[PDB]
Amino acid sequence: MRHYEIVFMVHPDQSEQVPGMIERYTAAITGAEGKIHRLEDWGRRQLAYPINKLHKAHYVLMNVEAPQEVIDELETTFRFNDAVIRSMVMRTKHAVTEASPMVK
Amino acid sequence: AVVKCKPTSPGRRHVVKVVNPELHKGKPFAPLLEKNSKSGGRNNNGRITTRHIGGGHKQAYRIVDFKRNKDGIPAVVERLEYDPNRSANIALVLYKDGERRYILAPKGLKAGDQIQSGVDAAIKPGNTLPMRNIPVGSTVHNVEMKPGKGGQLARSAGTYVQIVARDGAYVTLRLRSGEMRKVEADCRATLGEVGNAEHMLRVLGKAGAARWRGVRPTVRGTAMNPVDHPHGGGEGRNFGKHPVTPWGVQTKGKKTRSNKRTDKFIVRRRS
Amino acid sequence: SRVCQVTGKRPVTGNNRSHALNATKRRFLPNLHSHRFWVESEKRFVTLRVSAKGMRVIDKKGIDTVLAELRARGEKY
Amino acid sequence: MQVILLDKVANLGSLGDQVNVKAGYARNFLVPQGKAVPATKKNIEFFEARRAELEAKLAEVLAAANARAEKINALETVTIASKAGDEGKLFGSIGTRDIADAVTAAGVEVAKSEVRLPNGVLRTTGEHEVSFQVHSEVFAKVIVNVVAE
RNA sequence: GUUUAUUAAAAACACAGCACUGUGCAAACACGAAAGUGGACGUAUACGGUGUGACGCCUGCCCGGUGCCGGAAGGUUAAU
Numbered sequence: 001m002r003h004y005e006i007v008f009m010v011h012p013d014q015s016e017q018v019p020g021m022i023e024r025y026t027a028a029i030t031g032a033e034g035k036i037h038r039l040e041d042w043g044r045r046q047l048a049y050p051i052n053k054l055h056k057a058h059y060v061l062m063n064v065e066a067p068q069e070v071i072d073e074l075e076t077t078f079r080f081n082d083a084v085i086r087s088m089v090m091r092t093k094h095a096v097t098e099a100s101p102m103v104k
Numbered sequence: 105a106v107v108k109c110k111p112t113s114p115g116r117r118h119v120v121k122v123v124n125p126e127l128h129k130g131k132p133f134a135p136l137l138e139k140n141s142k143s144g145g146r147n148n149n150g151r152i153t154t155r156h157i158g159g160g161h162k163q164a165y166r167i168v169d170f171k172r173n174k175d176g177i178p179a180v181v182e183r184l185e186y187d188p189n190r191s192a193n194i195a196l197v198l199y200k201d202g203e204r205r206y207i208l209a210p211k212g213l214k215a216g217d218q219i220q221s222g223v224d225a226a227i228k229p230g231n232t233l234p235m236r237n238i239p240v241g242s243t244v245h246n247v248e249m250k251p252g253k254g255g256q257l258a259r260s261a262g263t264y265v266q267i268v269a270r271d272g273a274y275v276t277l278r279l280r281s282g283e284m285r286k287v288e289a290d291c292r293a294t295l296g297e298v299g300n301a302e303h304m305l306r307v308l309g310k311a312g313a314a315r316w317r318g319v320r321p322t323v324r325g326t327a328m329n330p331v332d333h334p335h336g337g338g339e340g341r342n343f344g345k346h347p348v349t350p351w352g353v354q355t356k357g358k359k360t361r362s363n364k365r366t367d368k369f370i371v372r373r374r375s
Numbered sequence: 376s377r378v379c380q381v382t383g384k385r386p387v388t389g390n391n392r393s394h395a396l397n398a399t400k401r402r403f404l405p406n407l408h409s410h411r412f413w414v415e416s417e418k419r420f421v422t423l424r425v426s427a428k429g430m431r432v433i434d435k436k437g438i439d440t441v442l443a444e445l446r447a448r449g450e451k452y
Numbered sequence: 453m454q455v456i457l458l459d460k461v462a463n464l465g466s467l468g469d470q471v472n473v474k475a476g477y478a479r480n481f482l483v484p485q486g487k488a489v490p491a492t493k494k495n496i497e498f499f500e501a502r503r504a505e506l507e508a509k510l511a512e513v514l515a516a517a518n519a520r521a522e523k524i525n526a527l528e529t530v531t532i533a534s535k536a537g538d539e540g541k542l543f544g545s546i547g548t549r550d551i552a553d554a555v556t557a558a559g560v561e562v563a564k565s566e567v568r569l570p571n572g573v574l575r576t577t578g579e580h581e582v583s584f585q586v587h588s589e590v591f592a593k594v595i596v597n598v599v600a601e
Numbered sequence: 602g603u604u605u606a607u608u609a610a611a612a613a614c615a616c617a618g619c620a621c622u623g624u625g626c627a628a629a630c631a632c633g634a635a636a637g638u639g640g641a642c643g644u645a646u647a648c649g650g651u652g653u654g655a656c657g658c659c660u661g662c663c664c665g666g667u668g669c670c671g672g673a674a675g676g677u678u679a680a681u
C-alpha cells in the first residue's frame with residue numbers, strides 16, 4: 001500500500017498507558033491488512049522546548065505500511081485523544097526496519 | 105443556492121430566492137405536528153404589546169427535539185424538511201427502535217448519515233454530547249444553558265458557538281454575538297454549524313413578501329402626531345430631539361440590561 | 376393579597392408629601408416574605424406569607440402559639 | 453436571640469450553653485436541625501434542670517453507633533464499575549450516590565448525604581480517597597476503586 | 602399599494618433594500634398595583650426600537666454644545 005512514518009508524543013502523565021494505546025493503533029494497521037515494520041518506544045524524553053506548558057514527553061516511533069483510509073482515521077485518533085500532544089505522520093518512500101539513530 | 109429572479113415585473117426585480125433542492129417536496133410527518141394559532145402580537149389583555157406582527161401564511165408547529173435525550177441509540181436522517189417556524193431547516197431522524205423525531209439540521213447533514221446522541225457520541229456533525237466531552241475549540245450549536253433543559257444557544261439558520269475554554273465545571277462559550285458566556289459543562293451541545301447558512305442571502309424583493317411572514321408595516325415615528333409618538337409634529341420634516349422609543353426610552357446607544365442575577369455567567373459583553 | 380398572615384397587616388394609603396407639600400396618594404406596602412417555618416410538633420414546613428414584624432412575633436411566641444391563632448382566626452396554612 | 457444548645461456546635465459552645473446567636477442562624481439552622489431550643493423561661497427549666505445530663509445519655513449513644521458505622525468498615529474493598537472511554541475519559545461519572553451504592557452493598561447501608569469528595573466528579577479511573585462525615589465528630593477514610601467496564 | 606368615512610388620494614404614510622443601536626433568554630421591550638401574558642413554544646442569519654427609503658455612482662470635515670457610552674483617582678452630596 002502506502003508507507004508512512006508516524007511519531008507521536010504522549011503526555012508523560014499517561015506514560016503508563018502507552019502500551020495501552022499501541023495495542024489498538026497497531027491493531028488498526030494489522031487489522032486493515034497492513035504491515036507494521038518497526039515499533040520503537042523511545043521512552044520518556046526531555047523536550048527542547050516546553051510544549052503545552054510541560055517539559056517531558058513519552059515518544060513512540062512507529063513505521064506503518066497502511067492503505068490511506070486507516071491513517072486519516074489514525075490522525076483523527078491522535079487529534080481527539082487528549083493524551084498525545086503532537087503527532088507527525090511523515091510519508092516515506094520505502095519501509096525502513098533498520099533501527100533509529102536514537103535507539104543506541 | 106440562491107437564484108436571482110429575472111425582472112419580468114417590478115417586485116420580481118430584486119427578489120433573490122434560496123432554492124434548496126434537498127428539502128422534502130411533500131407533506132410533513134403528521135404525528136410531530138401541532139396547532140400554531142397566530143396571535144397578532146396581543147397578550148391575554150388583548151392589547152398590542154409587540155407591534156408589527158399580524159397577518160401572514162398559516163403555520164403548524166413542528167415538535168422539534170431540542171432536548172435530544174435518546175442516548176446511545178443511533179439515528180439515520182430520513183429527509184430534510186422546510187420549517188416555517190424558524191430559519192433552520194429540520195431533519196426527520198429515524199432511530200433504530202422506530203421513533204421518529206425532528207432535529208435542527210447541521211451544516212453538512214443530509215439524508216443517510218447516521219447521527220447519535222449520548223455521552224459516548226462520536227465527534228462529527230449531528231452528534232449531541234455534554235460539553236465536558238466535546239473538545240475545546242470546536243464549533244457546536246443547539247447549546248443548552250441549564251442541563252437537561254433544551255437547546256437555546258445557536259439555534260438560528262447559520263449560527264454556531266465556539267467552546268473557547270474549559271476550566272473545571274464551566275465552559276466558556278464564544279457566543280454568536282461575541283459575548284463570552286459561561287455555561288455548565290454538563291449541558292448538551294449538538295456538533296457542527298447549523299444548516300441553512302445562506303438564509304441571510306435572501307432578498308424579499310417586494311413589500312408583500314414581508315406580509316407573508318407576518319410583518320405588518322412599520323410606521324416610523326417622525327411622521328406621527330406629537331400625541332402619537334415623541335417624534336411627532338413639525339410643520340415640515342422636523343426632528344429636533346433625541347431618538348427615543350415610543351415610551352421615552354433612548355434607542356441610539358442606551359443599554360437596557362437589568363438582569364443582575366446572571367451577571368456572573370458573563371465574562372464579557374459583546375463589542 | 377398583601378396581607379401578612381400573622382400580624383394581619385395590610386397596605387395603608389397615605390400621601391407622598393413633597394417639599395411644597397403636594398399630596399399624591401401612595402400606598403405603604405408591608406414587608407411580606409414567603410417563608411418556610413419548621414413546625415417542631417408536626418415536623419413539616421409550613422409556608423406562611425408573613426411580614427418582617429411577623430417573624431419577630433414568631434421568634435417570640437413560638438410557631439406553635441402563632442399557628443394556634445391561625446386556626447381560631449379561621450385561616451389556612 | 454438567646455438560644456439554648458443540645459449538641460456541640462463547632463465555634464459557639466457545647467450542650468447546655470445560653471449563647472447569643474444572630475436571629476436567622478437559630479431560625480434557619482439551629483432550631484430546624486434540632487440542635488437548639490429558643491431559650492424561653494419555660495425551656496430553661498425543661499432542660500437545665502431535667503435534661504442537663506439526661507441528654508448525655510442520648511447524645512453519646514448517638515456517637516456510640518458512630519464507630520459502629522465506621523470501625524466495622526475495616527474491609528476497604530469497594531469497587532464501582534462505570535463505563536469509560538479509553539485511558540480515562542469517563543462515560544458515566546461516579547457521584548456521591550454512586551459511592552453510596554457500593555459502600556451500601558459492601559458494609560453499611562449508608563445515607564448519600566455523608567460522602568465528602570475533594571473532587572466530586574471522580575472522572576479519572578484510579579484510586580481516590582473518599583472521606584466521610586457520618587457524624588460531625590469522627591471521620592472515615594475509605595478509598596474507593598473505579599474499575600473500567 | 603395606503604390615507605383625511607362626509608371639500609385634501611398627493612410629492613404624504615408604507616415598501617423591499619441600507620445603517621445605527623438595544624437584546625445571551627426567566628431576553629430587550631410592551632400590557633398588567635401583582636399573578637401572568639405578548640415577545641416565542643422564536644434564541645443574535647433571532648427580536649425590539651430608531652432614522653433613511655428600490656437600483657446605479659456615492660455619503661465629506663467638526664465631539665465645542667446637547668444626549669448616549671466607557672472610565673472612577675480626586676472634589677462635592679442623601680438616608681443612616
Ligand SMILES: [Mg+2]
Nearest residue numbers: 155156322649
Ligand atoms: Mg418591528
Ligand SMILES: [Mg+2]
Nearest residue numbers: 321322323324
Ligand atoms: Mg417605515
Ligand SMILES: [Mg+2]
Nearest residue numbers: 321322323324
Ligand atoms: Mg423598516
Ligand SMILES: [Mg+2]
Nearest residue numbers: 327328329337
Ligand atoms: Mg402627520
Ligand SMILES: [Mg+2]
Nearest residue numbers: 330331333334
Ligand atoms: Mg409626547
Ligand SMILES: [Mg+2]
Nearest residue numbers: 339340341342
Ligand atoms: Mg422645515
Ligand SMILES: [Mg+2]
Nearest residue numbers: 342343344345
Ligand atoms: Mg435646527
Ligand SMILES: [Mg+2]
Nearest residue numbers: 396397398399
Ligand atoms: Mg389637592
Ligand SMILES: [Mg+2]
Nearest residue numbers: 602603610611
Ligand atoms: Mg398607486
Ligand SMILES: [Mg+2]
Nearest residue numbers: 605607608609
Ligand atoms: Mg376626503
Ligand SMILES: [Mg+2]
Nearest residue numbers: 603604606610
Ligand atoms: Mg377609503
Ligand SMILES: [Mg+2]
Nearest residue numbers: 605608609610
Ligand atoms: Mg377625494
Ligand SMILES: [Mg+2]
Nearest residue numbers: 324341653654
Ligand atoms: Mg423619508
Ligand SMILES: [Mg+2]
Nearest residue numbers: 658659660661
Ligand atoms: Mg469607493
Ligand SMILES: [Mg+2]
Nearest residue numbers: 660661662663
Ligand atoms: Mg455625514
Ligand SMILES: [Mg+2]
Nearest residue numbers: 664665666667
Ligand atoms: Mg459631546
